[PDB]
Ligand binder design. Structure first.
Ligand SMILES: O=C(O)[C@H](c1ccccc1)n1sc2ccccc2c1=O
Length: 167
């Protein structure tokens, strides 16, 4: 039993809700919240910008120190940093950004990072301004992640489309 509430059940291990991931993280205070990161951990826009704003820029400060020490991530890769006021930990996962010309095939590798954590609150990787079809992101998710994932979908109309077309 966990403190997630109001999710539709897609599969044995994947649940989905029409919710703002920022407000959901503040309410649940999950163990792990997933960020839609880029390799530089530059959290300017999208989910990354929104999560970072909710931490009062503490996420960016921590991230810049991480990059200065370790260099960039790989597309498909991840790192675990603090969750600040939103969660215990933030798993920064780099899905491919189609709008940058990155290989959509790396989406499965990106989702594999989720399997290192028993329970996660997450957005649809590579969707939004990363340019991949959210329907495809949900499919790769369900077919890759074996741990318990709670997906927050921001847009109501997209949420409706994702559920009704899910096989
Ligand atoms: O609603 C959501 O959660 C997702 C989403 C996933 C990751 C980051 C930001 C947004 N949306 S809304 C939306 C509106 C127009 C076109 C695409 C999307 C889309 O993919």
């Amino acid at each position: 039993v966990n403190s997630f509430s109001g999710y539709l059940k897609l599969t044995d291990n994947v649940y989905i809700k029409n919710a703002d991931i920022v407000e959901e993280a503040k309410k649940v205070k999950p163990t792990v919240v997933v960020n839609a990161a880029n390799v530089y951990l530059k959290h300017g826009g999208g989910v990354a910008g929104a999560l970072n704003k909710a931490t009062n820029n503490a996420m960016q400060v921590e991230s810049d120190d991480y990059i200065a020490t370790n260099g960039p991530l790989k597309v498909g890769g991840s790192c675990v940093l603090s969750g600040h006021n939103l969660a215990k930990h933030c798993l920064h996962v780099v899905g491919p950004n189609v709008n940058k010309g990155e290989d959509i095939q790396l989406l499965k590798s990106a989702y594999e990072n989720f399997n290192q954590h028993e329970v996660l609150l997450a957005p649809l990787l590579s969707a939004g301004i990363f340019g991949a079809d959210p329907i495809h992101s949900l499919r790769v998710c369900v077919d890759t992640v074996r741990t318990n994932v709670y997906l927050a979908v921001f847009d109501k109309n997209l949420y409706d489309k994702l559920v009704s077309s899910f096989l």
